[PDB]
Amino acid sequence: ANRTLIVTTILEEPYVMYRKSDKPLYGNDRFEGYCLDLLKELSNILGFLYDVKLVPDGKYGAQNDKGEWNGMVKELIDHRADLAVAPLTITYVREKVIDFSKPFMTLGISILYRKGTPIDSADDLAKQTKIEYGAVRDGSTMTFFKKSKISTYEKMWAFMSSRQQSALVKNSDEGIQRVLTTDYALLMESTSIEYVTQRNCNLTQIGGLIDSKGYGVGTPIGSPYRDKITIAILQLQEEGKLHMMKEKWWRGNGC
Amino acid sequence: RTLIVTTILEEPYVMYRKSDKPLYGNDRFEGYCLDLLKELSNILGFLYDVKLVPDGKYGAQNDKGEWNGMVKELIDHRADLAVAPLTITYVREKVIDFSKPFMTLGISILYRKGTPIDSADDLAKQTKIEYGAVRDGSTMTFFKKSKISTYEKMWAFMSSRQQSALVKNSDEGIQRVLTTDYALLMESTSIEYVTQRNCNLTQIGGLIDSKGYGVGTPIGSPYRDKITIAILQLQEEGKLHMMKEKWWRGCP
Numbered sequence: 001a002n003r004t005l006i007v008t009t010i011l012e013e014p015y016v017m018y019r020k021s022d023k024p025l026y027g028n029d030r031f032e033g034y035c036l037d038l039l040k041e042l043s044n045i046l047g048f049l050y051d052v053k054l055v056p057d058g059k060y061g062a063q064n065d066k067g068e069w070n071g072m073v074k075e076l077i078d079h080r081a082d083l084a085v086a087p088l089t090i091t092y093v094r095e096k097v098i099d100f101s102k103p104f105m106t107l108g109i110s111i112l113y114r115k116g117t118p119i120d121s122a123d124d125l126a127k128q129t130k131i132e133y134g135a136v137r138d139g140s141t142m143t144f145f146k147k148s149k150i151s152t153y154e155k156m157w158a159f160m161s162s163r164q165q166s167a168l169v170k171n172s173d174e175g176i177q178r179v180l181t182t183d184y185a186l187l188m189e190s191t192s193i194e195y196v197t198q199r200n201c202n203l204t205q206i207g208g209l210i211d212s213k214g215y216g217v218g219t220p221i222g223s224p225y226r227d228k229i230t231i232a233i234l235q236l237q238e239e240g241k242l243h244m245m246k247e248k249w250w251r252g253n254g255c
Numbered sequence: 256r257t258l259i260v261t262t263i264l265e266e267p268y269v270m271y272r273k274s275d276k277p278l279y280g281n282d283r284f285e286g287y288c289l290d291l292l293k294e295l296s297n298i299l300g301f302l303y304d305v306k307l308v309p310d311g312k313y314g315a316q317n318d319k320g321e322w323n324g325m326v327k328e329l330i331d332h333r334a335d336l337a338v339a340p341l342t343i344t345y346v347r348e349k350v351i352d353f354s355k356p357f358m359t360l361g362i363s364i365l366y367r368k369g370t371p372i373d374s375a376d377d378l379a380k381q382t383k384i385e386y387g388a389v390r391d392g393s394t395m396t397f398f399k400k401s402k403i404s405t406y407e408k409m410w411a412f413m414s415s416r417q418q419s420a421l422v423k424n425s426d427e428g429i430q431r432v433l434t435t436d437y438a439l440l441m442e443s444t445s446i447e448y449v450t451q452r453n454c455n456l457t458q459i460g461g462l463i464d465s466k467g468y469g470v471g472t473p474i475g476s477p478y479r480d481k482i483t484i485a486i487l488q489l490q491e492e493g494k495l496h497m498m499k500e501k502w503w504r505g506c507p
């Protein structure tokens with residue numbers, strides 16, 4: 001009797017969302033989105049049953065000063081989940097404590113800002129002070145700036161952290177609202193930017209990607225599923241299914 | 256002990272260093288992958304001996320299912336590591352353990368500048384301009400199996416007339432582009448390398464799929480995860496990007 005895998009995930013549009021329904025929904029049927037479609041495709045290739053559970057603390061995964069982890073990462077470390085199927089960024093510190101699959105998405109930091117401005121790059125942002133710019137506090141983008149030894153990015157981190165980190169935002173949602181309302185440019189993961197620009201015709205991605213990273217399925221260290229999940233991901237990649245899935249959930253109504 | 260690294264001669268990843276005197280050992284070679292190997296060695300603290308794969312192949316299966324190239328060196332435990340632009344594919348990942356990718360890339364089009372061709376679709380709608388790919392390589396496999404209508408049509412063209420539109424390898428493909436009316440579909444890293452050095456040529460459109468290059472290790476290697484963690488370190492330090500710019504920089 002094959003065991004049902006527990007899948008930890010997080011509410012995050014368009015990866016995982018409650019489905020709209022005129023009757024109560026139960027189990028996996030409660031949810032829809034990119035990561036649900038991904039799960040269905042993985043399950044079809046590998047032949048496993050699964051149980052989607054929202055991570056209780058609603059976090060991706062970071063460690064405090066005591067080395068203790070939270071979020072989906074912690075669920076995996078503690079073996080309360082078999083897989084984390086979510087847009088979990090593959091980072092050095094996370095890869096040390098869990099086994100990531102190969103990336104099902106590749107992306108990077110870029111800029112979300114208004115159209116029709118003199119800004120065309122990170123360097124354009126860096127050499128001025130009138131247009132405020134920043135990032136989500138304590139996220140992947142912030143870490144990149146905090147740790148970069150590139151002159152242009154060091155100067156941007158200095159600006160970002162000045163005035164008691166006023167230029168930083170709490171999370172991606174508040175950042176996007178800030179762009180929409182005030183004169184503010186948001187540095188963030190490009191996936192998030194694409195989703196927004198598809199839906200907000202007055203905003204745009206500026207410059208290219210300034211680094212590179214992927215999203216991977218998380219599994220516990222020593223997981224017997226990680227290598228199989230990787231091979232399934234590569235199969236979906238080569239057959240063009242990941243690309244199709246991304247387009248399905250990202251594409252807006254046109255601008 | 257010293258790790259044996261299998262690799263392959265391929266510009267600008269691995270090249271014989273130019274010298275007025277004989278060179279020996281690792282000092283014989285230079286390129287992006289040697290720079291990568293240096294950085295990995297610095298982080299993980301291993302010594303290494305670089306050895307060109309005898310058959311000068313990346314890794315594919317013959318009709319009897321036998322593997323060749325760097326992949327085979329790994330399967331047979333004749334090398335600890337493959338540090339080369341080894342494309343992470345479904346069939347290869349089944350028989351060796353790949354690191355996370357140190358480069359991400361995709362299929363694109365190499366062609367002459369200034370033409371009305373702007374996408375694969377523009378090629379597929381016509382037959383005057385020949386187009387194809389390297390026979391039996393990664394690009395071909397994508398077309399061979401795609402169920403996108405436009406790519407299905409292109410594969411039928413490529414495979415027609417005794418595969419006249421296919422080429423033996425990337426180098427001959429590139430020559431075919433420079434001398435005749437021919438568009439080559441291939442890995443974008445190769446296209447970027449060429450177009451930095453030949454202002455006659457350009458990339459058409461964007462990437463029509465996605466894939467990475469990974470360090471290869473034999474299945475079960477304890478180095479795979481350590482190498483992956485080192486790659487993520489270099490990625491986050493911005494070092495991989497730096498190394499790419501160094502070796503690719505050379506047109507309007």
Ligand SMILES: CCC[C@@H]1CN[C@H](C(=O)O)[C@H]1c1cccc(C(=O)O)c1
Nearest residue numbers: 060087088089136139140141188189
């Ligand atoms: C909307 C997608 C959330 C993304 C999905 N991947 C990131 C993660 O795995 O932690 C989330 C994250 C958290 C906080 C800040 C950023 C950022 O872009 O600078 C990203």
Ligand SMILES: CCC[C@@H]1CN[C@H](C(=O)O)[C@H]1c1cccc(C(=O)O)c1
Nearest residue numbers: 313340341342389392393394441442
């Ligand atoms: C110049 C670098 C050779 C690349 C490096 N990565 C590929 C590999 O690992 O097999 C090589 C390869 C072999 C045959 C055809 C193609 C293609 O682009 O369609 C690529």
Ligand SMILES: [Cl-]
Nearest residue numbers: 052053054055
């Ligand atoms: Cl739940």
Ligand SMILES: [Cl-]
Nearest residue numbers: 101102354355
């Ligand atoms: Cl991996």
Ligand SMILES: [Cl-]
Nearest residue numbers: 305306307308
């Ligand atoms: Cl040699």
Ligand SMILES: [Cl-]
Nearest residue numbers: 312313314315
């Ligand atoms: Cl091959």
